[PDB]
């Protein structure tokens, strides 16, 4: 009484409503540190003028 387990399972059946269906989620966070920038885009580099 008044002592519960903090977690609970999802009920994921293929017949569940889209609202209750499982969705995979990925969150991309970008970070500039006090360190070299090592993650870069595919943009081609050019010569310097």
């Amino acid at each position, epitope marked *: 009484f008044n002592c*519960y*387990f*903090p*977690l*609970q*399972s999802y009920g994921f059946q293929p017949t569940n409503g889209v609202g209750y269906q499982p969705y995979r989620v990925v969150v991309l966070s970008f970070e500039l540190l006090h360190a070299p920038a090592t993650v870069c885009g595919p943009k081609k580099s050019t010569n310097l003028v």
Partner: nanobody
Framework: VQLVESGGGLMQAGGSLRLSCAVSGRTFSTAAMGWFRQAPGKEREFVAAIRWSGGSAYYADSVKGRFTISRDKAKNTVYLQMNSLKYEDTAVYYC????????????????????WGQGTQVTVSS
């Protein structure tokens, strides 16, 4: 996934028996284990449940103060220590397993379990 029960059998009233139920095969997770029993001509009836995480136990009224459910996570085994045996305890005892995590332990008394053992006879004599 298989539930393999052992122990039990014949014991005189007032005595104690221990049932074991070992889980074999690849499991992703275990939420809870339970013991049920079915006496001849009667409906299968909840006995006890234990949450795998933390080991909190829930008991049918009929076995409180007499039976203890316990778990060995490393051996993937649940136990029922059946003390102060009475004739009314004579039944086939079934191990059950679920991956369903309820916040509410008492739910394990009425939850339909996913996996069942073959059943082990306990017979209490005079």
């Amino acid at each position: 996934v298989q539930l393999v029960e052992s122990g039990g059998g014949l014991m005189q009233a007032g005595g104690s028996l221990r049932l074991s139920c070992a889980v074999s095969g690849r499991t992703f997770s275990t939420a809870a284990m339970g013991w049920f029993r079915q006496a001849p001509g009667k409906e299968r009836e909840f006995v006890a449940a234990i949450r795998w995480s933390g080991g909190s136990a829930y008991y049918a009224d009929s076995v409180k103060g007499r039976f203890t459910i316990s778990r060995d996570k490393a051996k993937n085994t649940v136990y029922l220590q059946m003390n102060s045996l009475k004739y009314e305890d004579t039944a086939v005892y079934y191990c059950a397993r679920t991956e369903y995590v309820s916040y509410l332990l008492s739910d394990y008394a009425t939850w339909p379990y996913d996996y069942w053992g073959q059943g082990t006879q306990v017979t209490v004599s005079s």
